[PDB]
Design a binder for these strands. Structure first.
Ligand SMILES: Nc1nc2c(ncn2[C@@H]2O[C@H](COP(=O)(O)OP(=O)(O)OP(=O)(O)O)[C@@H](O)[C@H]2O)c(=O)[nH]1
Ligand SMILES: [Ca+2]
Ligand SMILES: [Mg+2]
Lengths: 271, 73, 783, 70, 79
RNA sequence: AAGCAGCUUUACAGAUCAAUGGCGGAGGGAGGUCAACAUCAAGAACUGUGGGCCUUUGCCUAUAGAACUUAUAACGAACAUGGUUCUUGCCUUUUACCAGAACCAUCCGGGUGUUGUCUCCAUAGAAACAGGUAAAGCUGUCCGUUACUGUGGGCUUGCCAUAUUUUUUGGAACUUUUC
């Protein structure tokens, strides 16, 4: 009932078990969930920065997508004696509204505009506060029927259960923790520290740490920009075609034994 | 009860009226006041004939019902 | 590359109800209802339209397994690629659906879904002029905001029925975590707030005016829907209409008896909490936390709701959506509120009286329809038309008159071949979101799409066809449409290659067509000027200009504004200017209350009111208002020659007492000069605003021919307004936006720092948005 | 069926009454009821001789009511 | 039930009817009711002798309504 | 939501022990770091089926079934290398390299379906026979309970009970002429 079988392909969990994993995984999954955090700091804004050769603070830098800007028409249109300087167009504006604040934008994608301002209230300190409770941050603001007529759920007396505080907590958490079901991944497919450099660093970090944050963003943007798709024909798979023959056999051994063999085996091949 | 009227549902019947007319046509609906609606109606005053179409006769005007033909598929 | 659209007619999704039966409803004018959904940003309007669309069909090919479980929203009416990518509603769209109320009576309803962002209020105006009824959708966290208040006022001003949806009730439980008592006081605060802006009309849940919804979790309910579902069976039939009135507000139940006050020793809850809210929270709390085998028995014994085996493996958010859609059946209760929420006998007379001139009747033998907007639907150009009379067929030849041409034609009929051109109707369709359903003919009162009209007008049209000539005396023409905001934001364009200018011109016309709130001007120097509502509005315009309509590059400008010209004091010198005509014009400031009413276009105050277009016809009624309300002199009040876009022209001169029939021949020649002057100015060729003009002295030469004297007075009265203004301490005027800010409470000093860094930017109101940790801040910022 | 019909647009209007027994009388409808009983002022029956009376009509025996002027 | 709502879905179209009096009228329907009340405009009354007449507005009785006639296209309406 | 009847089965005692009628069954069930085959990016997009036009491709119209993968777009909530061709950087040449683009590949992985096989458990059962495809009770025969009852479970149920004005406690009864 928890996994499908020994082949270990699918899993299916329960709510007190998912809470407990969610509580244990606090120091690696602690992150800012609401989508307005990533305003001007998501993929398409990094794509627009790369394509316009403009630099969001904290974001990566690239080579110019259109490096030849030496061509120039001497025209009266953008003459400064015509122009009213009232607000400096800082570079965050060019990413937020790319067709308005840029003349000649190419290879630009339309950004997501807004998300509703999130009002989620949760506490971390006391677990014994109820699920429904007034937050200190909130603004304070003839005829008879037959008896045994009741509310339709008057038979169950309470609306706060011992697990419904955890359920709500799980409901707002990000993937994979807002689900109780799923398939299994490889251990190298789980990107544990990737959510750290997708956020803004700090101010108090030294410059050595803040450079490393931007270098990790830069590789992230280039992987999203140039996808390489797998081809459907390639199911041949070296280790399956090799176990068809007489010459290979199977056994089961310790990992440290298997690796000490490959050291001995590779030293023979080179000699 | 009301088990007998539903089993005739989707069936052509002959229902005699209090005035004496017997309209014939397939049964579309039935109600708690004896209100029935019929499709393909033909009244027989008597040697005569009449073509109406879809009618919903009342429970006051009805006398009885008797099924003429079995259910059509 | 532009839209997601079902091109193949075999791939049009099959509908549960019969299409042909719905088309047979179109002959009966009463069975058709037009509803427009309006609201602020992200109130849930498009996802309210999706609950209606999903229930009518059986399988939708674009629907993914991800949106079918409930993780992502279908956004079926967000058809465009820019709406998918901005994540906003930019253009009006809708569907024609068959809707069956609580007593199983089917109604053909055309919905029109309007975008809720503030820079797209011109799209709201197209929906307001097309809809018998409006749904105004509110957010239960955000509340009755200042944008909500303006939408309340515009529907009262458009004589349409308003019915309210309080959306996003999930945020009241899962996000804010309010106990079931406080959410009652919260909902009470909003309904009390709505009635403060709607005068003489009360809005309450028992009246079926106010619908509670949560469109993410996929349900709508009314109390009259909810009692007919689950409470009607237990108590007898005579009580169910009396019982429902006791649900809302300060009346209590303990053991069979209803009284207004709490009992001595009973937990004290109102009827709405006891019978509706606490069972609603027990749905949320037990779908999350309760064991499935225990939960399955409760939903079977209390609701007659059976859970399949597939639903028991669901993740918690799709399981919460599945149970709530299994308890609340369909949108029937929302459909039922529309029917009782609108009586056409009271408003269909006053609504067509507002969209044209008020007149006694239409002969209804003639076809009389209203073109509202040209739309870029699918891969072609269509026209969104509401028909008011007659019958329109595919193949008709119809007269199409632009509504800027209508006002002069309306003045001619009060005093033979029609100048209005003729066009064939090539194809007729019905709105389906991502498709057009072809229908051969259209009837009175239904909103459809027509191909073959678009070339004959720019923004709007009046669509008519006659067989007589006596109806040409009878016929009434539509006004130009009031788009609710005004285009101030200014960007100047130039094509990057000069040879590409013929391709820019073809694109700037379509952008003048598909965007009804845009003013395209051409200056004298060859530069083009675009005017619109804001940053987001330009960005969307400039995208379709760069990527859709012209595939050329454009040099554009920094953000700008339009200025106006006024004066601080009266003219001192009263200089005459001569081209042998001797015109002498003074110029004064108008009152701060006088200009105040001309922007609203209502004249007077309170008890007697005068429309700005009817202002010339009644002289005696006008001067009665001008003397009583504003305290003007009687010599001015009988002699007000004209009212213009902010300014006034008043006659205080001597030879009108002497030779008025000499000068009455010239007032049409003078008033063409006064209009051609004030459209520009003396300072910067900017239009003049808020200046009181007096003509002090006029001298006309003797024995000169009238036809050459027409040519002299127009540029000279142009100059005398210039010389009259330049002697009056001329000033430059500047538009100022109003600001609406939602912010969290401890971040309030930071938002004040932003308002100080801008120039002329003050805040006024700081409103505690009650029961939330949020503030509302109202202020002003210059454009 | 406690909802009475809508004769409120014809209240204080001229009527052309239809009743049981081939009876007709003219009068201004003053009030209505749940059962369709009416109140007529200026009672004048339709014989050919029309006698003025100046009337509370019973509901069930009446069949319908018409308008003299549209 | 289906016999009462079937008439309310026919409103706007024309239907024929039968009386306990014996005469029939015909006209496009304006309102119905749960009693079997009626409301039409432009009736075409016809007695058993056959005298044709004109009646502008007519409200009807539920008991006096004998047997009514509905539109033939309204037979595909779902119950 | 109890009881009563109806409905469906059910452990069943059965009327029939015939011919029948229904639901199941013609290869038990769950599994495997087993295998072969098919398929997985496109007019928002799918095959098949019936009719018509043309004389099957096409087209129009009717209709069934659509598993997986995609909208802040995709088999993978992950993320590497190579080739060609431009444009660059560093520069004594080649390799090895700098870093942007366009077009292609390779590699490490994945889903769904089908048949086969293996493991454990169960078993008598008719899992028997014969036609054939790219696949199957795909089709015929066939059998297991067995179609009318009584005991037991559940509901899809009866709407839940109105003699005093619009339907079910009667305004009926009776007479007579004309064709
Ligand atoms: N919490 C919560 N969010 C909702 C609910 N309904 C819609 N939303 C979210 O609100 C956002 C608005 O999406 P839309 O449905 O397009 O709302 P909209 O008002 O039509 O959007 P605009 O037209 O641009 O104003 C989306 O992110 C929805 O997921 C709801 O019931 N509860
Ligand atoms: Ca509902
Ligand atoms: Mg929207």
């Amino acid at each position: 009932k928890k996994v499908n079988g020994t082949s270990y392909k699918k899993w299916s969990f329960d709510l007190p078990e998912m809470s407990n994993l969610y509580r244990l995984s606090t120091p690696l999954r602690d992150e800012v969930t609401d989508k307005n955090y990533y305003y001007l700091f998501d993929k398409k804004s990094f794509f627009n920065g790369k394509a316009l050769n403009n630099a969001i603070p904290g974001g990566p830098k690239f080579e110019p997508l259109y490096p030849r800007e030496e061509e120039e028409d001497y025209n009266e249109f953008n003459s400064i004696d015509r122009v009213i300087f009232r607000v400096p167009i800082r570079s965050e504006y060019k990413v937020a509204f790319p067709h308005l604040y840029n003349s000649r934008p190419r290879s630009v994608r339309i950004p997501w505009y807004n998300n509703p301002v999130s009002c989620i209230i949760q506490n971390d300190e006391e677990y014994d506060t109820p699920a429904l409770f007034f937050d200190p941050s909130l603004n304070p603001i003839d005829f008879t029927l037959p008896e045994d007529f009741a509310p339709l759920l008057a038979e169950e007396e309470e609306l706060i259960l011992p697990n419904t505080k955890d359920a709500m907590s799980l409901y707002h958490s990000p993937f994979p923790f807002n689900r109780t079901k799923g398939k299994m991944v490889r251990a190298q497919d789980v990107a544990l520290a990737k959510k750290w450099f997708l956020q803004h660093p700090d101010e108090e970090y030294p410059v050595k740490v803040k450079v490393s944050y931007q270098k990790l963003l830069k590789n992230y943007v280039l992987n999203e920009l140039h996808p390489t798709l797998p081809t459907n024909h390639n199911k041949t798979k070296l280790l399956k075609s090799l176990k068809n023959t007489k010459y290979f056999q199977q056994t089961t051994i310790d990992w440290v034994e298997a690796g000490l063999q490959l050291c001995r085996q590779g030293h023979n091949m080179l000699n | 009860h009301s088990s007998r009227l539903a089993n005739l549902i989707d069936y052509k019947l002959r229902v005699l009226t209090q005035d004496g007319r017997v309209y014939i046509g397939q049964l579309m609906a039935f109600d708690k006041h004896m209100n029935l609606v019929l499709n393909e109606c033909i009244e027989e005053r008597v040697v005569e004939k009449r073509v109406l179409g879809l009618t919903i006769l009342r429970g006051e005007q009805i006398l009885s019902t008797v099924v003429e033909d079995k259910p059509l598929l | 590359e532009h839209t997601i659209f079902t091109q193949l007619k075999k791939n049009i999704p099959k509908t549960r109800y019969n299409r042909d039966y719905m088309l047979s409803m179109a002959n009966i004018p009463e069975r058709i209802i037009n509803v427009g959904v309006i609201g602020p940003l992200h109130s849930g309007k498009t996802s309210l339209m999706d609950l209606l669309v999903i229930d009518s069909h059986k399988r939708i090919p674009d629907m993914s397994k991800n949106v079918e479980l409930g993780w992502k929203p279908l956004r079926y009416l967000d058809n465009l690629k820019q709406e998918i990518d901005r994540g906003l509603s930019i253009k009006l769209n809708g569907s024609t659906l068959l809707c069956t109320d609580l007593e199983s009576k089917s109604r053909m309803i055309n919905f029109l879904d309007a975008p809720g962002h503030v820079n797209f209020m011109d799209e709201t105006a197209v929906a307001l002029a097309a809809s018998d009824l409006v749904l105004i959708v509110i957010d239960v966290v955000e509340g009755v905001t200042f944008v909500v208040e303006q939408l309340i006022k515009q529907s009262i001003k458009n004589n349409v029925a308003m019915c309210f949806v309080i959306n996003k009730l999930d945020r009241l439980i899962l996000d804010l975590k309010l106990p079931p008592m406080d959410a009652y006081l919260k909902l009470n605060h909003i309904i009390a707030n709505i009635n403060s802006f709607t005068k003489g009309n009360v809005f309450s849940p028992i009246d079926n005016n106010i619908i509670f919804a949560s469109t993410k979790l996929g349900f709508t309910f009314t109390i009259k829907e909810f009692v007919s579902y689950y409470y009607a069976h237990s108590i007898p039939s005579s009580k169910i209409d009396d019982f429902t009135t006791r649900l809302w507000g300060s009346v209590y139940y303990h053991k069979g008896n209803f009284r207004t006050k709490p009992f001595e020793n009973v937990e004290k809850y109102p009827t709405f909490v006891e019978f509706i809210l606490i069972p609603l929270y027990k749905i949320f709390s037990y779908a999350l936390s309760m064991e499935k085998d225990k939960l399955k028995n409760l939903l079977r014994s209390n609701f007659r709701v059976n859970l399949s085996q597939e639903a028991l493996q669901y993740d918690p958010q799709p399981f919460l959506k599945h149970v709530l859609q299994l308890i609340f059946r369909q949108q029937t209760g929302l459909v039922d509120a529309i029917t009782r929420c609108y009586q056409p006998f009271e408003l269909f007379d006053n609504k067509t009286a507002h969209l044209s001139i008020p007149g006694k009747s239409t002969p209804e033998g003639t076809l009389w329809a209203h073109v509202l907007k040209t739309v870029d639907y699918g891969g072609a150009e269509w026209s969104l038309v509401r028909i008011y009379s007659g019958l329109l067929k595919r193949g008709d030849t119809v007269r199409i008159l632009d509504t800027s041409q209508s006002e002069s034609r309306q003045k001619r009929q009060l005093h033979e071949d029609d100048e209005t051109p003729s066009c064939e109707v090539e194809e007729i369709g019905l709105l389906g979101g991502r498709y057009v359903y072809p229908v051969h003919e259209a009837h009175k009162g239904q909103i459809v799409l027509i191909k073959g009209i678009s070339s004959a007008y720019i923004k709007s049209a009046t669509l008519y066809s006659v067989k007589s000539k006596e109806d040409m005396k009878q016929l009434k023409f539509f006004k130009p449409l009031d788009y609710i905001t005004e285009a101030v934001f200014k960007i100047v364009l130039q094509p990057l290659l000069p040879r590409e200018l013929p391709k820019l011109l073809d694109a700037l016309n379509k952008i003048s067509k598909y965007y009804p709130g845009v003013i395209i001007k051409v200056e004298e120097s060859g530069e083009h000027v675009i005017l619109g509502n804001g940053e987001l509005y330009m960005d969307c315009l400039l995208y379709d200009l760069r990527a859709s309509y012209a595939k050329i590059e454009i040099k554009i400008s920094d953000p700008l504004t339009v200025f106006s010209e006024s004066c601080s004091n009266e003219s001192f010198a009263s200089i005459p200017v001569s081209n042998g005509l001797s015109i002498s014009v003074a110029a004064e400031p108008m009152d701060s209350k006088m200009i105040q009413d001309l922007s609203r276009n209502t004249l007077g105050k309170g008890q007697n009111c005068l429309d700005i277009d009817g202002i010339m016809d009644n002289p005696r009624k006008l001067s009665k208002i001008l003397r009583t309300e504003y305290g003007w002199d009687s010599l001015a009040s009988r002699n007000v020659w004209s009212f213009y876009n902010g300014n006034v022209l008043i006659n205080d001169t001597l030879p009108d007492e002497i030779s008025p029939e000499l000068l009455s021949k010239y007032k049409e020649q003078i008033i063409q000069g006064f209009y051609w002057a004030v459209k520009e100015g003396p300072l910067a060729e900017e239009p003049i605003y808020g200046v009181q003009y007096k003509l002090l002295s006029i001298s006309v030469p003797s024995d000169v021919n009238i036809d050459v004297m027409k040519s002299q007075i127009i540029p000279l009265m142009k100059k005398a307004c210039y010389v009259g203004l330049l002697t009056a301490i001329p000033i430059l005027l500047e538009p100022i936006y109003e600001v609406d800010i939602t912010v969290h409470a401890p971040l309030l000093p930071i938002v004040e720092e932003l308002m100080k860094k801008r120039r002329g930017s003050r805040i006024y109101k700081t409103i505690k948005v009650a029961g939330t940790p949020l503030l509302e801040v109202r202020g002003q910022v210059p454009v | 069926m406690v909802s009475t019909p809508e004769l409120k647009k014809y209240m204080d209007k001229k009527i052309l009454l239809n009743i049981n027994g081939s009876r007709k009388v003219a009068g201004i409808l003053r009030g209505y009821d749940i059962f369709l009983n009416v109140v007529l002022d200026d009672a004048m029956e339709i014989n050919a001789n029309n006698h003025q009376l100046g009337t509370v009509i019973r509901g069930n025996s009446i069949i319908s009511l018409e308008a003299l002027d549209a | 039930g289906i016999p009462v709502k079937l008439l309310n879905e026919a409103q706007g179209h024309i239907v024929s009817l039968e009386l306990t009096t014996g005469a029939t009228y015909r006209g496009k329907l304006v309102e119905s009711e749960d009693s079997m009340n009626v409301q039409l405009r432009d009736v075409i009354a016809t007695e058993p002798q056959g005298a044709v007449t004109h009646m502008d507005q007519i409200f009807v009785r539920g008991s006096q309504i004998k047997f009514i006639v509905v539109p033939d296209l309204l037979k595909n309406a779902p119950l």
